[model samples]
Target: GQQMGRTLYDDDDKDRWGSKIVVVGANHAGTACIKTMLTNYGDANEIVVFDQNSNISFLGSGMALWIGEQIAGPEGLFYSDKEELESLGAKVYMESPVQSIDYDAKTVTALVDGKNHVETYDKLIFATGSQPILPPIKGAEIKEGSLEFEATLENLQFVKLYQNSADVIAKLENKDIKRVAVVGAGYIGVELAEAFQRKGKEVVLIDVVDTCLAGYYDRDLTDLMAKNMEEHGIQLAFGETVKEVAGNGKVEKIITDKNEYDVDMVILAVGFRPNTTLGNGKIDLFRNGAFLVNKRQETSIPGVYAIGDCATIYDNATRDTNYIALASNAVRTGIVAAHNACGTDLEGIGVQGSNGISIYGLHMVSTGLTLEKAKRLGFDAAVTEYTDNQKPEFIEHGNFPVTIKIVYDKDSRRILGAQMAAREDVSMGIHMFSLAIQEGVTIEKLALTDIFFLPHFNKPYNYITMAALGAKD
Candidate 1:
């Protein structure tokens, strides 16, 4: 692999027309945008991408998958390399951070190697992404083992980091940690709890919410997940908040509102906030500080666009604009922005905030809005759940318990969302719900919808159809 090129100015002869596109933040969204530009408009456009980090790959994105032995290595998380981007006729600048944007003059001022370099652009893409939000716990300043912080340059050396759990064990050798405490029972926290448990450490999962997955799934599904976590010897501390992290230099004890836990390792997976400073307060932002963009991914400024975690997009379920920081949404928004920047007008299909997680040999999927979330958002919602074998009982290796929960409008019968958990892969079932929600398919329609089934695959009546039928009852 070739090293990323140092900062360099574009040659005077290089094409710069309505085609010069400059993308800031070379992470997942930025890379996807530039890749699309290079593919569709390479002949007529000049593409340049800059990032503060030397590498663009997400080495720690799939922490649980790696720890659970699902993925062979960190290789699967990365989509492109510096050399790969360079081969596509795109100028890649590593260690370059955009300082400010002059929307009026259509130029970006970036800091590169302790020097300022200005670049002109016809269209600007703010893939400026987000940073993790660490909670306000005493002694948290010195605590280690945070997955968010591990993504930084100072903590992770990609060459030296592999085998997620085993590598984590090597990093904790000096701390001498056997008992691990994972804060926040969201997807990340649950995954990390399972990862640490699989690594032969006693893991304690703490959260303020009573359920394992609070707003993501219904109570029934969450209860099953909690039971499974407890069955695996993982401690569950619910309805509590961490007060202080007491330790000398590293982590020693975690004192919560309800109880105190002694642990050697503490992983903070609370959540994240948008990194929207790149707009330099020139663009309009949402109340939560996420950059606001239209269906075309264009910001308030004419030629400026925002995408990914730092930006807010429309949500079909709510029929409103909201911030959803997910990689799946980022890549789709990136492609949409890229196309519009290159003279093609394509609107972003609103996101359902669909996501999934795998832990303790179980797979869980959630899409659209949960019943609790729908009600909170002022929707008159009703929910129904069904548990049954995914496949025929006579099939030797195909039988597994699959539970589906469907939330629909009580008056309109429109499907709001769906969630599923099973030993088998039920992610595809969630996808069906995602599409159904997007198309505004009602419960009545789902019961009579066409679906293919085989004895070796799934039951005669799909669990999704069954859930909708159960909702009507």
Candidate 2:
């Protein structure tokens, strides 16, 4: 049950004329909160959705994997539709974009196919989602060089057709894309590299850093990642520099610091930038061009909130600002923002960066503090890594090696962060570790707790417990 008496209503009591609340953006935590508002709140009749795109997107799991291609097609990507939303008595402005905003007047200025229409609202929700960033390079946004369509329903079918078509897949599939180059090597780049290798593409993943995933995971774990990538025919071009993407319309070659490689197509998954320019000068923005919002998701102007990739929210642990744009954070922010945006008595939830992904048959996931993150924060932190047997020595088929790294407070023994990699289903283990971090659980509590495990499920000692038990305060 939610705690009542959180007074968010600020002078909108008798003035509330049906409560027109406008929500912008398509995906990244917008849909769930929208649905929550319609089902829970009584202001559905006055709610309006202003999105530039025709369809509402769920951004299911962020990326559609090879595992769940059949079930979640186009409509599957979204949790609710315009009709279902209409059933809830909400109006959706599809293909219409809210162009400008007047924070003082609490007005949403929209451009419906070039005409100007301003709608006055009691509150505003800014779930305007983030955009995929492309770096300034030669021919970066070219039709062949870039993929405009996302892994959504409209494009998922095309992706499936491209992947499933014998001739097309043969052309796109780089079975012999040996000595391949992948810049960025972030989550998407890393995943793509692993996926490419599964189809026998010799990957040369190039990132400027000496380490991969340096911000989230520690170098030790990153070192392990490098080793793993190398083991699966994916080479690492660490600390390597690339000046430009000067290719002959089609990529025939790439010039890097060490050497040049005759390449096929260069998948540059460098990094993501916020969509500050969309409404950049239109509103009061931060230096980095992100919408500055408080814990309640209210921007510099009241009644307006921004969530998802477009906006930057505060981190719970650091209290510093960052655009930790993940789906998990976006949804929570959207809900809280919606509540507060509608002048409801509720506070928004702060974001804790929790992410997980699979790479080359091994599951790699992390959340909360790594040893490096803790050390940078001036904490006495230490990390312990263990590669041990998952099941009993007698078990014949249950011999999977699992690696668990626990970063702990040296003085308090509180688990600061954790990283888990295994051949088995270790993705959930990392999620559990993330949850433990959020709760600030101690090593002893984690080790002594009775965890459900079966021969068919997990190891009796459960590798995680064993690792925790071994890691000292």
Candidate 3:
């Protein structure tokens, strides 16, 4: 394959005056941007999409299965058909990859069916999403016993093809696929451990941090997940990293900095970096390789926009940037960017930061600032954590234990952040706090807010409302 070249456009390109748009990357952000153009700017006579994958798998559901194998099959991962999208008046070019995005010219150049196509737009959005980044570890790509050490650099098809032809699950299920190691015990690694254990696999979950979910949740919540993972038969390889990968050409042993284990498969679950290949020199980028966009999701170049995992989503509370590469944020952000792309003059609200995941009925959810983040943001932050029943003592299932935290500023009494893990459905409680953060709701309001609870719904004192009460103590 020939190296793809950067495409440039003329300053006064009269040919691009009328009606067209070209969107690259077919994930949540790209698809959302396309939907917005079709929904709002129907005046655009032509809308074209380019992606390396033939399928646009709904990423949220896929992540669950990827980590845990607890979800349904691949059929459950699809958001919509390409044909359906086309019927709504847009051109979707599957298996077509973009080579470069010419921000200066407000255009995209892509390779479709082995031919180069130049597309110009009055406005362009670089929703190139993100790719999983693997550390530069030597011999990381060694193959052993039909299991391949992999990174998520290619489209979802790379995994889809393997899922379709190879009886990967069956092989792992019926065979002796024990001693599985998942590096970087983030959400994906932890969830996958639960899934693998459910399928009777002996898993070793490893990370350089002493605690899992360190970046996502606060200590109180993460300790719970760590204990849960331990109870579920996953060996904790915490605070350790793999120094090398050594296996006989056929199949065999593995070595990390701390220890060596006889392992069958290794999943590099570390993390991903932004896909800035096309826009490398074209747009401003942050240290994490995410796009540098302002309040409006517009790049340094006028008429060009960026969003999703690829763009640096500013933490509104911290006034700093982080790779909040999430589907929920991506879709909403692309929609907001679409408004501004059409000159609506509304910059998108920055991300408030929220994430959730569950394993074996153990639910972990978080939103807004953590105690650590609140303190870092110069708030006089305090955290209150307690476990209690969700409903009245008389209600049976309502007695499921719930752990909750409320992070607030002592001076202003403003709600900064909150998180929860519960056998019951207190995840909604955390979500409500997320809304509070978005709306700048204060502790005073939450302390007195009417969050009704019945005997069946919650205990006489729901934990969320109680947190506000406990904050006083």
The alpha-carbon lDDT assigned to residue 93 of candidate 2 equals 79
Winner on TM-score between 1 and 2 is 1
Clashing pairs in 2: 74-153
lDDT of 1 at 123: 86
Sorted on TM-score, best first, the list reads: 1, 3, 2
Query: What C-alpha lDDT, on a 0 to 100 scale, does residue 446 get in candidate 1?
Result: 87
| Best of the two (1, 3) by TM-score | 1
Which one wins on lDDT?
Answer: 1
Count clashing pairs, candidate 1: 0
The lDDT for every candidate, in the order shown, is: 0.78, 0.64, 0.68
Q: Model 3: which ten-residue window has the lowest total lDDT?
A: 1-10
Can you give the TM-score per candidate against the true fold? 0.89, 0.80, 0.86
Candidate 3: residue pairs that collide: 67-192, 68-195, 132-272, 133-272, 390-459, 391-458, 391-459, 392-459
Tell me which of candidates 1 and 3 scores higher on lDDT.
1
What tens-digit string does per-residue lDDT give for candidate 2 at 237-278?
A: 778766554454445565667767666656666765566454
Question: Which regions of candidate 3 are displaced past 4 Å?
Answer: 1-19, 66-69, 141-176, 373-380
